[PDB]
Design an enzyme around this catalytic site. Structure first.
Site, PDB file in Angstrom:
ATOM      1  N   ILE A   1     -65.588  13.452 -32.542  1.00 42.02           N
ATOM      2  CA  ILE A   1     -65.600  12.631 -31.338  1.00 42.02           C
ATOM      3  C   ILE A   1     -66.209  11.271 -31.654  1.00 42.02           C
ATOM      4  O   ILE A   1     -65.639  10.227 -31.336  1.00 42.02           O
ATOM      5  CB  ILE A   1     -66.381  13.316 -30.206  1.00 42.02           C
ATOM      6  CG1 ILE A   1     -67.376  14.326 -30.785  1.00 42.02           C
ATOM      7  CG2 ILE A   1     -65.426  13.979 -29.224  1.00 42.02           C
ATOM      8  CD1 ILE A   1     -68.533  14.639 -29.871  1.00 42.02           C
ATOM      9  N   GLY A   2     -67.381  11.293 -32.277  1.00 42.27           N
ATOM     10  CA  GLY A   2     -68.082  10.077 -32.640  1.00 42.27           C
ATOM     11  C   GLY A   2     -67.700   9.591 -34.023  1.00 42.27           C
ATOM     12  O   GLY A   2     -67.821  10.323 -35.005  1.00 42.27           O
ATOM     13  N   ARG A   3     -67.233   8.350 -34.097  1.00 43.23           N
ATOM     14  CA  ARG A   3     -66.832   7.758 -35.365  1.00 43.23           C
ATOM     15  C   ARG A   3     -66.541   6.272 -35.209  1.00 43.23           C
ATOM     16  O   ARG A   3     -65.644   5.735 -35.858  1.00 43.23           O
ATOM     17  CB  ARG A   3     -65.611   8.478 -35.938  1.00 43.23           C
ATOM     18  CG  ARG A   3     -65.618   8.596 -37.456  1.00 43.23           C
ATOM     19  CD  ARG A   3     -66.564   9.692 -37.919  1.00 43.23           C
ATOM     20  NE  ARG A   3     -67.573   9.191 -38.847  1.00 43.23           N
ATOM     21  CZ  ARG A   3     -68.657   8.517 -38.481  1.00 43.23           C
ATOM     22  NH1 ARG A   3     -68.880   8.255 -37.200  1.00 43.23           N
ATOM     23  NH2 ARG A   3     -69.521   8.103 -39.400  1.00 43.23           N
ATOM     24  N   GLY A   4     -67.300   5.613 -34.340  1.00 43.88           N
ATOM     25  CA  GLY A   4     -67.148   4.189 -34.117  1.00 43.88           C
ATOM     26  C   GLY A   4     -67.498   3.446 -35.390  1.00 43.88           C
ATOM     27  O   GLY A   4     -67.203   2.259 -35.535  1.00 43.88           O
ATOM     28  N   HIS A   5     -68.130   4.164 -36.314  1.00 47.20           N
ATOM     29  CA  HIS A   5     -68.531   3.620 -37.612  1.00 47.20           C
ATOM     30  C   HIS A   5     -69.418   4.612 -38.362  1.00 47.20           C
ATOM     31  O   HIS A   5     -68.943   5.371 -39.211  1.00 47.20           O
ATOM     32  CB  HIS A   5     -69.260   2.283 -37.456  1.00 47.20           C
ATOM     33  CG  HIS A   5     -69.741   1.709 -38.751  1.00 47.20           C
ATOM     34  ND1 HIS A   5     -71.066   1.733 -39.131  1.00 47.20           N
ATOM     35  CD2 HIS A   5     -69.069   1.126 -39.772  1.00 47.20           C
ATOM     36  CE1 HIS A   5     -71.191   1.172 -40.320  1.00 47.20           C
ATOM     37  NE2 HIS A   5     -69.994   0.798 -40.733  1.00 47.20           N
TER      38      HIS A   5
ATOM     39  N   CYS B   1     -71.214  10.346 -37.899  1.00 46.68           N
ATOM     40  CA  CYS B   1     -69.974  11.085 -37.668  1.00 46.68           C
ATOM     41  C   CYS B   1     -70.232  12.283 -36.755  1.00 46.68           C
ATOM     42  O   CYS B   1     -70.108  13.437 -37.178  1.00 46.68           O
ATOM     43  CB  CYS B   1     -69.370  11.552 -38.997  1.00 46.68           C
ATOM     44  SG  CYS B   1     -67.793  12.433 -38.852  1.00 46.68           S
ATOM     45  N   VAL B   2     -70.597  11.996 -35.507  1.00 48.73           N
ATOM     46  CA  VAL B   2     -70.888  13.035 -34.524  1.00 48.73           C
ATOM     47  C   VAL B   2     -69.825  14.139 -34.492  1.00 48.73           C
ATOM     48  O   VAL B   2     -68.625  13.867 -34.534  1.00 48.73           O
ATOM     49  CB  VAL B   2     -71.188  12.443 -33.125  1.00 48.73           C
ATOM     50  CG1 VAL B   2     -72.633  12.716 -32.733  1.00 48.73           C
ATOM     51  CG2 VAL B   2     -70.904  10.946 -33.097  1.00 48.73           C
TER      52      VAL B   2
ATOM     53  N   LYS C   1     -74.802  13.632 -35.011  1.00 50.01           N
ATOM     54  CA  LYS C   1     -74.456  12.435 -35.772  1.00 50.01           C
ATOM     55  C   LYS C   1     -75.295  12.302 -37.047  1.00 50.01           C
ATOM     56  O   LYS C   1     -76.487  12.614 -37.057  1.00 50.01           O
ATOM     57  CB  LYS C   1     -74.569  11.184 -34.898  1.00 50.01           C
ATOM     58  CG  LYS C   1     -75.986  10.801 -34.512  1.00 50.01           C
ATOM     59  CD  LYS C   1     -76.026   9.363 -34.025  1.00 50.01           C
ATOM     60  CE  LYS C   1     -77.161   8.585 -34.659  1.00 50.01           C
ATOM     61  NZ  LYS C   1     -77.439   7.335 -33.904  1.00 50.01           N
TER      62      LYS C   1
ATOM     63  N   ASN D   1     -72.889   1.925 -23.385  1.00 50.85           N
ATOM     64  CA  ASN D   1     -74.069   2.616 -23.943  1.00 50.85           C
ATOM     65  C   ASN D   1     -74.697   3.679 -23.031  1.00 50.85           C
ATOM     66  O   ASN D   1     -75.765   4.192 -23.317  1.00 50.85           O
ATOM     67  CB  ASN D   1     -75.147   1.587 -24.318  1.00 50.85           C
ATOM     68  CG  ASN D   1     -74.992   1.065 -25.716  1.00 50.85           C
ATOM     69  OD1 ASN D   1     -74.514   1.769 -26.611  1.00 50.85           O
ATOM     70  ND2 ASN D   1     -75.428  -0.166 -25.931  1.00 50.85           N
TER      71      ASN D   1
ATOM     72  N   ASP E   1     -78.255   4.511 -26.539  1.00 44.28           N
ATOM     73  CA  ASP E   1     -77.928   3.449 -27.473  1.00 44.28           C
ATOM     74  C   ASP E   1     -77.191   4.065 -28.654  1.00 44.28           C
ATOM     75  O   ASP E   1     -77.758   4.851 -29.434  1.00 44.28           O
ATOM     76  CB  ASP E   1     -79.172   2.693 -27.932  1.00 44.28           C
ATOM     77  CG  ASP E   1     -78.855   1.277 -28.396  1.00 44.28           C
ATOM     78  OD1 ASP E   1     -77.742   1.059 -28.925  1.00 44.28           O
ATOM     79  OD2 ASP E   1     -79.703   0.374 -28.202  1.00 44.28           O
TER      80      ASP E   1
HETATM   81  N1  LIG Z   1     -69.778  13.276 -26.108  1.00 41.68           N
HETATM   82  C1  LIG Z   1     -71.071  12.946 -26.586  1.00 41.68           C
HETATM   83  C2  LIG Z   1     -71.218  11.877 -27.481  1.00 41.68           C
HETATM   84  C3  LIG Z   1     -72.488  11.546 -27.956  1.00 41.68           C
HETATM   85  O1  LIG Z   1     -72.553  10.483 -28.848  1.00 41.68           O
HETATM   86  C4  LIG Z   1     -73.759   9.826 -28.964  1.00 41.68           C
HETATM   87  C5  LIG Z   1     -74.161   8.893 -28.006  1.00 41.68           C
HETATM   88  C6  LIG Z   1     -75.392   8.245 -28.128  1.00 41.68           C
HETATM   89  C7  LIG Z   1     -76.216   8.517 -29.231  1.00 41.68           C
HETATM   90  N2  LIG Z   1     -77.450   7.844 -29.331  1.00 41.68           N
HETATM   91  C8  LIG Z   1     -78.450   8.163 -30.229  1.00 41.68           C
HETATM   92  O2  LIG Z   1     -78.315   8.688 -31.325  1.00 41.68           O
HETATM   93  N3  LIG Z   1     -79.721   7.837 -29.794  1.00 41.68           N
HETATM   94  C9  LIG Z   1     -80.051   7.208 -28.602  1.00 41.68           C
HETATM   95  O3  LIG Z   1     -79.223   6.702 -27.866  1.00 41.68           O
HETATM   96  C10 LIG Z   1     -81.506   6.804 -28.619  1.00 41.68           C
HETATM   97  C11 LIG Z   1     -81.841   6.045 -27.380  1.00 41.68           C
HETATM   98  C12 LIG Z   1     -82.119   6.732 -26.177  1.00 41.68           C
HETATM   99  C13 LIG Z   1     -82.418   6.006 -25.024  1.00 41.68           C
HETATM  100  C14 LIG Z   1     -82.438   4.609 -25.097  1.00 41.68           C
HETATM  101  F1  LIG Z   1     -82.729   3.899 -24.004  1.00 41.68           F
HETATM  102  C15 LIG Z   1     -82.160   3.927 -26.280  1.00 41.68           C
HETATM  103  C16 LIG Z   1     -81.854   4.643 -27.426  1.00 41.68           C
HETATM  104  C17 LIG Z   1     -75.804   9.443 -30.188  1.00 41.68           C
HETATM  105  C18 LIG Z   1     -74.587  10.098 -30.053  1.00 41.68           C
HETATM  106  F2  LIG Z   1     -74.232  10.997 -30.993  1.00 41.68           F
HETATM  107  C19 LIG Z   1     -73.586  12.288 -27.524  1.00 41.68           C
HETATM  108  C20 LIG Z   1     -73.362  13.324 -26.634  1.00 41.68           C
HETATM  109  N4  LIG Z   1     -72.137  13.669 -26.162  1.00 41.68           N
END
Ligand SMILES: Nc1cc(Oc2ccc(NC(=O)NC(=O)Cc3ccc(F)cc3)cc2F)ccn1
Length: 295
Positions: free
Chosen positions: A33-37, A40-41, A59, A158, A171
């Site tokens: 799902i995650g791979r904007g760069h 690799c979620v 990720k 975000n 973020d």
């Molecule tokens: N479908 C799905 C896709 C997902 O993707 C992601 C989306 C986001 C992150 N972000 C991350 O690693 N850390 C934070 O955001 C830290 C942070 C927390 C609060 C703030 F205010 C500032 C920074 C990682 C992911 F994997 C996740 C769950 N479900």
């Protein structure tokens, strides 16, 4: 084969009271799902003894590529350790087997990011639903401000959305880069690369706009970096067709030229909870033809 224990004495002993045993968490690498760069979620499931289960987002990044920007990976996801607010993305745990690349684990967000969700044409939001999403971001933002935490990149792209439609501020991851999201930035940050809570307020105002336009890109015509010249002309984003007057007034307060004249996130929760309570959910927001396909 990396001398890890050399990170931080009473500074990075955090991955401890935050780590978890793989004896309760699996990993599904194929489906992604995650791979904007980077990061690799994937997917995955943790366990809470004999019964409680859970789906997740995992990720990760490189490895033997030294540790320079590798320690900023573990130190980033750990930033969430004390982020306990329904409107803020949380840290499930941390686990790094004796051979598994830097793994970050987050609760699964069914509806993905706020911007993609609202741009989706099979979705039928109402003015109320959208004002509700803005109210939730304001709430999470109020929590973060309370912790003297400066987001620096508040944008609808975000924010996460879960199965109950709870918005989680996050973020998906320098004061002169091209990656600088200048279109969400306050005048003072564009000039002096300094960020504050009052500069997240300006950014929050732009997120409300993205909301009321259902994910339209801000200042489409000025696809640049030189937004400062445009703004100093006496310009602001326009009032979306479906944005109530009292709400656009809040937006213009968020974009006050004087940072200190800007409302606090606490004042925003207050003002927006009122505007939201006046709606019943009979006003459907449609997509603007002139923004359709615009990126
Ligand atoms: N479908 C799905 C896709 C997902 O993707 C992601 C989306 C986001 C992150 N972000 C991350 O690693 N850390 C934070 O955001 C830290 C942070 C927390 C609060 C703030 F205010 C500032 C920074 C990682 C992911 F994997 C996740 C769950 N479900």
């Amino acid at each position: 084969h990396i001398d890890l224990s050399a990170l931080n004495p009473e500074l990075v002993q955090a991955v401890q009271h935050v780590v978890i045993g793989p004896s309760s968490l699996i990993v599904h690498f194929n489906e992604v799902i995650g791979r904007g760069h980077f990061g690799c979620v994937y997917h995955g499931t943790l366990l809470d003894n004999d019964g409680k289960k859970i789906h997740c987002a995992v990720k990760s990044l490189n490895r033997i590529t030294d540790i320079g920007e590798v320690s900023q990976f573990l130190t980033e996801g750990i930033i969430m350790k004390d982020f306990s607010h329904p409107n803020v993305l949380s840290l499930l745990g941390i686990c790094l087997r004796s051979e598994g690349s830097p793994l970050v684990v987050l609760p699964y967000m069914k509806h993905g990011d706020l911007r993609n969700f609202i741009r989706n044409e099979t979705h039928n939001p109402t003015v109320k639903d959208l004002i509700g999403f803005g109210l939730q971001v304001a709430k999470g933002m109020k929590f973060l401000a309370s912790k003297k935490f400066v987001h620096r990149d508040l944008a609808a792209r975000n924010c996460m959305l879960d199965e109950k439609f709870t918005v989680k501020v996050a973020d998906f991851g320098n004061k002169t880069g091209a990656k600088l999201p200048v279109k969400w930035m306050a005048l003072e940050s564009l000039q002096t690369q300094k960020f504050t809570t009052k500069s997240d307020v300006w950014s929050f105002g732009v997120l409300l706009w993205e909301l009321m336009t259902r994910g339209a890109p801000p200042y489409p015509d000025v696809n640049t970096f030189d937004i400062t010249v445009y703004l100093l002309q006496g310009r602001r984003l326009l009032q979306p067709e479906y944005c109530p007057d009292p709400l656009y007034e809040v937006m213009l307060k968020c974009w006050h030229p004087k940072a200190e004249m800007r409302p606090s996130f606490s004042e925003l929760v207050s003002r927006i909870s009122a505007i939201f309570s006046t709606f019943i959910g009979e006003h459907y927001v449609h997509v603007n033809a002139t923004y359709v396909n615009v990126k």
